[PDB]
Amino acid sequence: ANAAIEPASFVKVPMPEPPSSLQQLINDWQLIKHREGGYFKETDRSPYTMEVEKPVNTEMVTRNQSTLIYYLLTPDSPIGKFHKNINRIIHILQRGKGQYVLVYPDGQVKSFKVGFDYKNGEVSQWVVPGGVFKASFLLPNEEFDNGFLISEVVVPGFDFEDHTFLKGEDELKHLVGPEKAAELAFLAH
């Protein structure tokens, strides 16, 4: 809790197209649609590898030390559906405004806003622990033509073998009860 989930109109019913400025940026930077939704683009992957213990009795797997991506939400596709990661993820706000909703394994729900107006409780830099489900949606905002741009750094570096989607609203019901699950259903597959 803390933020109050109130999806703008384009969040509930996404728009067919994003404003042209966001289109430009999308094409110039060659961002692509992510599995979760929104646009992204891995811009860095450490040349350094590191061995890491991973449960299968565990097993050693090797990953890059770190990975960086640009992640962008837009009226075009404003939601980044509920997904979980093995490693902690660092998020750095760059432009616009958005909101995050985290579902902890014990079933606790947390939601907060991302933006540069810290006085009004807007975070511009946040970390979400591995194992914690997360989703985020675009918040309307001028200043960045209704867009939301952030940078993400994963350590060890991202690897889909470490990524897992919330299995629909079902598993949501299991985690937060039906009444809450229903509320956050728009953020899941």
Q: Which residues bind its own copies (CB under 8 A)?
A: 25, 28-29, 43-44, 46, 48, 50, 65-66, 68, 70, 88, 90, 92-95, 116, 118-119, 124-125, 127, 151, 153, 155-156
Contacted entry of its own copies, ligand ADE, none for residue 48, CB cut-off 5 to 8 Å set by kind: its own copies
Q: Please list the alpha-helical segments (H only) found in 17-167.
A: 20-29
- Give the number of other CB atoms < 10 A from CB of residue 92: 14
- The site string for ligand ADE over 31-70 (x = CB under 6 A, - otherwise) reads -----------x------------------------x-x-
Whose Cβ is closer to ligand ADE: residue 75's or residue 156's?
156
The answer to whether 147 and 95 have CB atoms below 8 angstroms apart is: yes
Note the Cα 77 to chain centre separation in Å: 13
Rounded CA-CA distance 169/13 in Å is 18
Whose Cβ is closer to its own copies: residue 11's or residue 102's?
102
Contacted entry of ligand ADE, its own copies, none for residue 141, CB cut-off 5 to 8 Å set by kind: none
Rounded CA-CA distance 133/131 in Å is 6
Instruction: Name the burial class of residue 20, with classes exposed (0-12), middle (13-18) and buried (19+) by CB atoms within 10 angstroms of its CB.
Output: exposed
Stretch that binds ligand ADE, among 74-82, 103-111, 150-158, 167-175 (CB under 6 A): 150-158
For the bound state, the minimum distance from the C-beta of residue 153 to ligand ADE, rounded and expressed in Å, comes to: 8
- Give the number of other CB atoms < 10 A from CB of residue 57: 4
Contacted entry of ligand ADE, its own copies, none for residue 92, CB cut-off 5 to 8 Å set by kind: its own copies
Whose Cβ is closer to ligand ADE: residue 31's or residue 103's?
31
Instruction: Name the burial class of residue 135, with classes exposed (0-12), middle (13-18) and buried (19+) by CB atoms within 10 angstroms of its CB.
Output: buried
Strands 89-96 and 148-154 come out as antiparallel
Residues 152, 155, 173, 185: which binds ligand ADE (CB under 6 A)?
152
Residue ranges binding ligand ADE (CB under 6 A): 42, 67, 69, 152, 154, 158
